A = this chain, B = another copy of it.
């Protein structure tokens, strides 16, 4: 049994940023995320401190939050949600691990919505990447996956502003575009239920974790100056 956590930053978020060593991608460590989830249920949702211990300590596993979509300045559409084959493939494989489409390799080309495309080009910051026709409906397939994983609300935000760009460009942008993770960044994370869990426990998990969906949490430093506020989604599989 698995739960899908979405983390959409509403303000610049600072989890020296926490980055994955061999990629350089920003990441929210599972240790940190588990902490804020624990604190939110104890303080805001008023869950009994007996139910919390029974679930966190454990009974579930809170994985590190990877990055799915990163907001980047765009010439047409003001900004686009950019991602990459590598990132998307990791997302598909993490869905497999949780129980739950072919995405090609891009080198110097991109696949983007027609709302951010101008003269067969998408202009991200200063990068001017050539688009290639979206055959076999890649974009429409990513949007559907976003809907399933995070809900209809998240899919509407992103739809119309998607751009799948080369892995190397995504890396460059994600490292050289602000310190703070920008607002309008979408993270995702797996919550896995341990095999040692009994049938009586699954009802507890579903009840307590269910409270998290659609709420607002604070992650990382600088809470007092409006940093690290995120909207969380949570769905079963």
Q: Which residues of B contact A34 (CB under 8 A)?
A: 224-225
A56 to B43, CA, bound (A): 20
A97-B216, A196-B43 are contacts. A78–B171 as well, Cβ < 8 Å? yes
Question: Do B190 and A58 touch (CB < 8 A)?
Answer: no
A177 to B22, CA, bound (A): 8
Which 6 pairs between the two chains have the least Cβ-Cβ distance? A63-B226, A30-B225, A30-B226, A58-B224, A43-B195, A22-B71
A73 interfacial contact with B, CB 8 Å: yes
Determine how close the nearest CB of chain B comes to the CB of A230; give it in whole angstroms.
10
Q: List 26 A-B contacts (CB under 8 A).
A: A10-B97, A12-B64, A21-B73, A21-B177, A21-B178, A22-B183, A23-B79, A30-B227, A34-B224, A43-B195, A43-B196, A57-B224, A61-B223, A61-B225, A62-B226, A76-B168, A77-B167, A78-B167, A78-B168, A78-B171, A97-B229, A97-B231, A105-B160, A192-B226, A192-B229, A194-B223
A220 interfacial contact with B, CB 8 Å: no
Determine how close the nearest CB of chain B comes to the CB of A109; give it in whole angstroms.
14
- Residue of B whose beta carbon sits closest to that of A59: B224
Question: Do B21 and A182 touch (CB < 8 A)?
Answer: yes
Interface readout for A58-97 with B: 1 if CB under 8 Å, 0 if not?
1011111000000111001111000000100000011001
Question: Do B195 and A44 touch (CB < 8 A)?
Answer: yes
Partner of A79, one of B22, B195, B224: B22
Segment 153-182 of A: residues with Cβ below 8 Å from B: 160, 167-168, 171, 177-178, 182
- Residue of B whose beta carbon sits closest to that of A31: B225
A62 to B225, CA, bound (A): 5
A97 to B71, CA, bound (A): 20
Interface readout for A1-42 with B: 1 if CB under 8 Å, 0 if not?
000000000111000000011111000011100100000000
Question: Do B22 and A62 touch (CB < 8 A)?
Answer: no
Q: Which residues of B contact A31 (CB under 8 A)?
A: 225
Q: Which residues of B contact A94 (CB under 8 A)?
A: 10
Interface readout for A86-123 with B: 1 if CB under 8 Å, 0 if not?
10000001100100000001010000000100000000
